[PDB]
C-alpha cells in the first residue's frame, strides 16, 4: 500500500466540491459513464489496428449496480483501463490543466455542473460518495486498486481481489444522506436524462 499526496490544484478542486453548497449531485453519474464511454472508446480505435488488445475481453458495456448494504454504487465499464503510472502520475498531470480552467471559470460564475467540459469530472464523484475505491486493468498492466476519501492525499495498491479481465470499476462509498443513489427509479430518471445516447450498453443491475 502507497500513499500519495495529490497535486495542490487537484486538492483545492476536491475540497472545493465537497464544501460548495450545490444541490444538483446527480450530475456525478453522467461523468462516471461519460468516462467509461470515452474508455471504451480508446480500446476499441486501439483494436483497428491490434486486434490481440481485446484478448482480455470483447464485450465493450456499462453497468451501474447499487448496493444497499454496502452502501456503494458501482461504475463498471470494462474500457481500455489504467497502469500505474496512470494512476500514480498520469492522471494528476493531466487533470491539473483543466483544474486551474475550472476554477477560473467558476468564480467568474461557471457552475460545477460544467465540471466535465474541463476534463475533471470524475472528482464530482465527492459531491455523493465519502470515499472512492477504483479498480482497473490495463493490457500492459497489473490489477491496481486506487483509493480516496479526499483530504490530499489517495493510495494505490496491487488488487489481489477478483480478476477484471480489462477495464474499471469506480465504486461510490455513498455518503449517509446520498442513499437515494442506490434507488432503481432514481438511477433509470438520471441515466434516461443525463446518458440517454451514450453508443454502448448500460445496464442498471437489481437487488
Ligand atoms: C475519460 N478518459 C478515459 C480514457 N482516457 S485514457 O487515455 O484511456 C487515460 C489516459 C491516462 F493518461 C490516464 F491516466 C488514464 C486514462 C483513463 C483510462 C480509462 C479510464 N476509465 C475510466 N472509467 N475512467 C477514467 C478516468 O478518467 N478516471 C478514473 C480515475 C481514477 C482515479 C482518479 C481519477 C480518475 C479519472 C479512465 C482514464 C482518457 C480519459
Redesign the pocket.
Known amino acids: 500500500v502507497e500513499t500519495f499526496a495529490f497535486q495542490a490544484e487537484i486538492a483545492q478542486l476536491m475540497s472545493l466540491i465537497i464544501n460548495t453548497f450545490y444541490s444538483n449531485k446527480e450530475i456525478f453519474l453522467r461523468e462516471?459513464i461519460?468516462?467509461?464511454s470515452?474508455?471504451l472508446?480508446?480500446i476499441r480505435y486501439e483494436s483497428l489496428t491490434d486486434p490481440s488488445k481485446l484478448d482480455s475481453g470483447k464485450e465493450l458495456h456499462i453497468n451501474l449496480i447499487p448496493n444497499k448494504q454496502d452502501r456503494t454504487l458501482t461504475?463498471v465499464?470494462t474500457?481500455?483501463?489504467?497502469?500505474k503510472?496512470?494512476?500514480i502520475?498520469?492522471?494528476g498531470?493531466?487533470?491539473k490543466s483543466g483544474t486551474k480552467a475550472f476554477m477560473e471559470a467558476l468564480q467568474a460564475g461557471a457552475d460545477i455542473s460544467m465540471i466535465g467540459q474541463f476534463?475533471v469530472?470524475?472528482?464530482s464523484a465527492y459531491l455523493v460518495a465519502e470515499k472512492?475505491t477504483?479498480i482497473?486493468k490495463?493490457n500492459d498492466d497489473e490489477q491496481y486498486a486506487?483509493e480516496?476519501s479526499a483530504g490530499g492525499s489517495?493510495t494505490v495498491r496491487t488488487d489481489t481481489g477478483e480478476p477484471m479481465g480489462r477495464?474499471?470499476k469506480?465504486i461510490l462509498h455513498l455518503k449517509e444522506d446520498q442513499t437515494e443513489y442506490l434507488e432503481e427509479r432514481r438511477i433509470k430518471e438520471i441515466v434516461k436524462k443525463h446518458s440517454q445516447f451514450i453508443g454502448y450498453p448500460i445496464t442498471l443491475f437489481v437487488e
Open positions: 462516471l461519460s468516462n467509461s470515452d474508455a472508446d480508446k461504475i465499464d474500457g481500455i483501463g489504467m497502469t503510472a496512470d494512476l502520475n498520469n492522471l498531470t493531466i487533470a476534463g469530472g470524475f472528482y472512492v477504483v482497473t490495463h486506487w480516496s489517495f477495464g474499471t469506480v
